[PDB]
RNA sequence: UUGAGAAGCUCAGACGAGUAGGCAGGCGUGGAGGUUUGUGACGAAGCCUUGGGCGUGAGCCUGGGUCGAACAGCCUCUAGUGCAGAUCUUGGUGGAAGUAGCUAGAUCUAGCGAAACCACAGCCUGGGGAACGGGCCAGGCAA
RNA sequence: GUACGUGAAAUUGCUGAAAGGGAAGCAUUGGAAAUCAGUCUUACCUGGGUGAGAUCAGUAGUCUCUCGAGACUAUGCA
């Protein structure tokens, strides 16, 4: 399933694996938005990636995730300077995103990639030492729109357990439970 | 407005090519729920059209359609090879491709 | 002769030509490019202010500014060649413009350029009839 | 001016000979199906019997208003649809000349084409109706024993979000 | 046996677009070095006896017909008998009244005349 | 305004419009895709004139 | 069955790089004898044109616009016969350039005004084996 | 229109058009805009009537050829 907007939560996701599969989906005329790009993991530990920006400017994740798809991606050819465009790197959810469902790349997820044990290092934690300075006040967003998320799930959750309620008590449920609804 | 769509949206990818010799005759269509090779046999045959508009008022209508069949597949992600009346322009990459459900075979 | 406008005949429109004028072409097209759809009366006070230094014709094409006199001595001619020619046919003063001007080689004997000059009006008529 | 004025060389005897069409086991008449292309495409129809190419099809005129009408087995759904008797109709009146486009007759004198002075309708003959409103009188009595089929043929078929037309078998 | 034809743009001289003095019309690049000549990619093409149409379908219009030039009218006489495969075409110089007498004679022959309505003006 | 169709000639135009309720019958030759002449005659039996049409240009041009 | 331009028509199979070089068939120009009882003031030749065609191609036929007095197809004869180069000859024309500047006025403003040079260009980073950077691929830049 | 036959290319000016991040350039495949290609049921066959004509007369003459082969002139239209 594709959809002409698509919300992508980078959390627990591989840079490389989450760059991939938004290459080929920018390719194919699809607009991609990318969320939390602050934690997104990368296999081996914080030094060697340390070492690797210092040999390496932006600072933002956002740019740095962008900056690996934008050599990702045929730049020089008017195509992939057009699908640039169309992928949206964010640090954290903003309000025009938090109201909308965040889906997750299986080829990308930490869990399913990486070997127990193995250590990895965070884009958001990597970032703050060289030159990013807005960790607090991007972390202090992140509780904030948790809370009130929360709070709407609970309500959400609470209407759930009506209708549930309510769908049980109807007698039209089981009247076909041969099909399976 | 739900209803209409007795059609299945795809995707048109790029054309058929080696690493840098291209071959626009056929087209690479990667539809919706296809995933296997096995899988586009079904589609197989079926009549592909690709559909744009112009400024141009010619009938009295907006609406020019390149029609298309659907030939043979193409690796093991569902994707399937297509020849229209007009190759496609180059520019429709990333595009959409209205895939009819005729001639059916069920 | 015949000239290089649809327009100009007898409508509401003069003209004017200049044959192996001993000035010098770059100068020519420059001063005839900025005079290009002003009025003529406007056409005629910016050519004043050139000769009084008040204005300086840009060079776009051939480079900014400068005050030549002697190529804008060449059009004063020209445009009043220009009016007289539409006073002959009678046509309605206040509301001309320069319509289209044009700046040519000539043969390399110096180098001289014809020019020629057109002058119009400009009207519009409501439909109405609602 | 009949002796062949040119050499004109004559088609060779082409051994093709025309056999019975093949058409699909679920084709069968009375079976509910899903018209494709037409400007009636997406309504749902029964077949009423089988033709040489096509398949003689109506939906119910109080329902759905689908006249008889030729339609091909390859623009054609078969549904696995509860089939529904169909023997009762008169099926053998139903061929390609009942069917058949008007042909390109009834010449005007020249004078009446122009100031455009006889246009024709060739608006649908009553017994075409009657003929239907036969099948209608002996179809519609058979549907709405089976239990919702008069509201399914009612409904207009669609495809929904994440449709696959292979896995859901119609 | 239908009009099919293997190629329809024209052969063009290599480098004859860079340089004015330098036609258009096909010549054979002899140069020792020229990998034009030696058929590299992105190259032009070259004329090659590959690329002969049909015999049986050589010099036809894409209508079938193969033109045939008529001067006078004399000459469109003896299209009688191959008017299902040849055309009358009318040389240029040929005067607007001897046109019309060619014309007409045509139209009664059943041959057809590519260029009939040159020079030439209908009266109702 | 009727586009002519079939084989029917100008002379029975003008006599098939006299019954219809005309007055007067224009005529737009055109060839080569280009107009060039008009004709009109004056219905029943009035004289007819025979111009040659040149410089037409539309009102877009 | 008409399919004898016997230099014709027809059938079958394999094959197709190319320098030096060898062989063959053609296209085109000026003029020459024959010919088309050829074309032409109702428009020859020429010329331009994103008109239409023909030929693998050299080339050809035609429409439109200009144009105004000649011209062509075919069979042979014949030769001062086909151009992108020769720091080629002659004529024309640009960029360079309103520059180098030179005649005034108050460095500026007017006025008068070259020659040299010129395949075409002009961000680099590296590697690209033979320089390769001035063009190629990876790159960034690129407004 | 005496800078005078035709007036090509280079080259320059004006206008309209689209395009215009350190080239351009051409080739393939299309698309788009702009524009041309070419449109044709109409004739054939059959039926009758109506008037005809002739290469036809259970017909009459001339001319050139070689009896009959043409071109005609009457006359009737079976």
Redesign the interface.
């Known amino acids: 399933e594709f959809q002409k907007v698509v919300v992508i939560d980078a959390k627990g996701h591989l840079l490389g694996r989450l760059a991939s599969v938004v290459a080929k989906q920018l390719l194919g005329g699809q607009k991609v938005v990318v969320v939390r790009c602050e934690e997104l993991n990368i296999s081996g530990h914080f030094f060697r990636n340390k070492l690797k920006y210092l040999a390496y400017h932006f600072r933002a994740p956002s740019r740095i995730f962008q900056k690996a798809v934008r050599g990702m991606l045929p730049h020089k050819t008017a195509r992939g300077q057009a699908a640039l465009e169309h992928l949206q790197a964010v640090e954290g959810i903003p309000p025009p995103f938090d109201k909308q469902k965040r889906v997750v790349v299986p080829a990308a997820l930490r869990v399913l990639r990486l070997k127990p044990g193995r250590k990895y290092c965070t884009v958001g934690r990597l970032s703050s030492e060289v030159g990013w300075k807005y960790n607090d006040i991007v972390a202090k967003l992140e509780e904030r729109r948790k809370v009130k998320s929360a709070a709407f799930y609970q309500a959400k959750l609470a209407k759930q357990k009506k209708i549930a309620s309510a769908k049980e008590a109807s007698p039209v449920n089981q009247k076909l439970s041969q099909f399976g609804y | 407005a739900?209803?209409?769509?007795?059609?299945?949206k795809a995707?048109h990818?790029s054309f058929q090519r080696s690493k840098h010799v291209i071959h626009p005759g056929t087209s690479i269509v990667?539809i919706?729920?296809?995933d296997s090779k096995e899988?586009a046999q079904?589609?197989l045959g079926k009549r592909v059209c690709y559909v744009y508009k112009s400024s141009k008022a010619v009938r009295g209508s907006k609406i020019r359609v390149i029609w298309g069949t659907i030939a043979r597949p193409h690796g093991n992600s569902g994707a399937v090879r297509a020849r229209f009346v007009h190759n496609l322009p180059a520019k429709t990459?990333?595009?959409?491709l209205r895939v009819?459900?005729?001639?059916?075979?069920? | 002769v015949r000239y290089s406008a649809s327009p100009a005949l007898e409508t509401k429109c003069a003209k004017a030509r200049g044959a192996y004028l001993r000035t010098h072409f770059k100068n020519s097209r420059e001063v005839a490019f900025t005079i290009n759809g002003m009025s003529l009366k406007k056409a005629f006070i910016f050519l004043d202010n050139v000769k009084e230094h008040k204005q300086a014709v840009p060079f776009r094409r051939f480079n900014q500014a400068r005050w030549p006199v002697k190529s804008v001595k060449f059009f004063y001619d020209l445009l009043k060649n220009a009016e007289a020619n539409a006073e002959a046919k009678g046509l309605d003063m206040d509301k001309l413009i320069i319509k289209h001007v044009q700046v040519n080689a000539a043969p390399k004997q110096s180098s001289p350029s014809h020019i020629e000059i057109i002058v119009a009006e400009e009207e519009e008529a409501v439909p109405k009839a609602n | 001016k009949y002796y062949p004025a040119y050499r004109e060389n004559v088609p060779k005897k082409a051994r093709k000979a025309v056999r019975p069409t093949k058409l699909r086991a679920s084709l069968a008449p009375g079976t509910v199906c899903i018209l494709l292309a037409g400007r009636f495409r997406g309504k749902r129809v029964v077949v009423l019997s089988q033709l040489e190419d096509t398949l003689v099809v109506t939906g119910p005129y109080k329902v759905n208003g689908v006249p008889i009408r030729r339609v091909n087995h390859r623009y054609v759904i078969a549904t696995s649809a509860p089939k529904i008797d169909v023997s009762g109709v008169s099926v053998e009146k139903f061929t390609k000349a009942y069917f058949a486009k008007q042909k390109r007759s009834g010449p005007v004198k020249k004078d009446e084409a122009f100031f455009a002075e006889n246009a024709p309708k060739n608006a649908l003959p009553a017994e075409r109706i009657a003929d239907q409103k036969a099948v209608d009188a002996k179809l519609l009595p058979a549907i709405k024993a089976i239990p919702n089929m008069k509201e399914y043929l009612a409904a207009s078929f669609a495809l929904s979000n994440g449709d696959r037309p292979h896995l859901m078998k119609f | 046996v239908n009009i099919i034809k293997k190629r329809t743009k024209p052969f063009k001289r290599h480098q004859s677009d860079r340089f004015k003095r330098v036609g258009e019309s096909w010549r054979k690049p002899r140069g020792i070095d020229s990998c034009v000549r030696r058929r590299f990619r992105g190259t032009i093409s070259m004329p090659k006896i590959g690329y002969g149409n049909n015999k049986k379908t050589r010099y036809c219009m894409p209508n079938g017909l193969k033109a045939f030039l008529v001067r006078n009218v004399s000459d469109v006489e003896l299209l009688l008998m191959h008017n299902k495969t040849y055309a009358a075409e009318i040389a240029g110089n040929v005067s607007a009244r001897k046109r019309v007498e060619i014309v007409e004679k045509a139209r009664a022959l059943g041959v057809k005349v590519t260029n009939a309505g040159a020079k030439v003006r209908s009266q109702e | 305004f009727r586009k002519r169709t079939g084989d029917i000639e100008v002379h029975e135009i003008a006599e098939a419009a006299a019954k219809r309720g005309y007055t007067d019958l224009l005529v737009l030759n055109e060839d080569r895709k280009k107009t060039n002449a008009l004709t009109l005659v004056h219905l029943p039996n009035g004289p007819s004139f025979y111009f040659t049409l040149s410089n037409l240009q539309t009102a877009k041009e």
Not at chain 2, 2 to 8: F, I, N, T, W
Not at chain 2, 100 to 106: T, V
């Open positions: 739900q209803g209409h769509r007795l059609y299945v995707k990818l990667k919706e729920g296809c899988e079904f589609y990459f990333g595009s959409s009819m459900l005729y001639p059916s075979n069920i």
